[PDB]
Amino acid sequence: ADLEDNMETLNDNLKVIEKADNAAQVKDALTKMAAAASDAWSATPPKLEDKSPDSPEMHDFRHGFWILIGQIHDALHLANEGKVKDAQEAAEHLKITCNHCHQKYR
Amino acid sequence: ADLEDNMETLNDNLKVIEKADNAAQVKDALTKMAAAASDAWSATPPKLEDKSPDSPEMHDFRHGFWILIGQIHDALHLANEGKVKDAQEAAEHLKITCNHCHQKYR
Amino acid sequence: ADLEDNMETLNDNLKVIEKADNAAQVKDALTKMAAAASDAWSATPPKLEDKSPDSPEMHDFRHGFWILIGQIHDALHLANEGKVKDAQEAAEHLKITCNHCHQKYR
């Protein structure tokens, strides 16, 4: 999908996690976020259309998605241990990564 | 594009890394492998077309790409520090992940 | 040495990172924090002296130090690439992990 669609997927599923009651909802939202992050890894954001794909900027840009993917990976493991509250708390971790990339690149 | 194309990208660039002389070659090959792994994350492999997308198998399948992506992430950091030999020996780490997924699902 | 000493090491060096100007200061503070986190991994915190060492609590407790160690690991890689501001903003990531463990066990 395009960067904007992936971002709406990330935004909708982050809310599902913050509002969730059971593990299955959290697991499903985390899996959908991981798919959106991986698909978004390739995208060139507007602020960086001018820059070459192996510029310092596009490397740092892509590095943000590695942070997020890793955070989702750990969150799903916690979710798969019945630790709903601990997996929901991952949301707080994910939001930092969301804001850090936004601050630099949208 | 498809799982088989992503795999040939992973295979070709793994060899480039093993036969590389300088950092730029290693960096470029690692970046291409990361793109292939991320793009492959969503694929349903032939031996798992029968299985449900939330089966233990498709979860374990996807988990393999998280391991590889994480390994590529660290390898590129080492590559970006001029540690060519340390980044090349990441290749040895990557091959274990290649074989583990292949053993179960190829 | 003890959990409280490790925590003051983490606290002092987190501030050094937030107020740093150059890479060497950030690198040095991150290295000291990594040493404190690793050394703290084995500690039994007061609020968990009652609990068995393989309880869900002491496992979750130890898991917190794995998150922090991983965050410090990535921060030092960024620091070693001359990306001072990117390494300093790791501080924001670290504080979430500090608070999550404190909320449950301090």
Place this chain on the structure above:
Amino acid sequence: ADLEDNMETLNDNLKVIEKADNAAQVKDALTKMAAAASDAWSATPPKLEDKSPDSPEMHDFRHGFWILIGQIHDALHLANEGKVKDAQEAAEHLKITCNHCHQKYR
């Protein structure tokens, strides 16, 4: 403990994992390996007594224990999902990290 004691702990528990029948044995061995790796993070190995503690060598040395700690972290998550075979296969991952550090530093 000293580096040699930590190494014997790593060696004994790696064998327990390769020989294990149930999750509890694997979980317990992984937890003991994590404790040994964290405690070993601080050690100065013989080949590097001459070198300063913030030399490139002692940084690369310590980086090896970050790889191992991360690998143990993932292995324990797999172990905590009843995936004994998948957690035992982590052993193959750990041995690469063992050999890579040995090759450079013992």
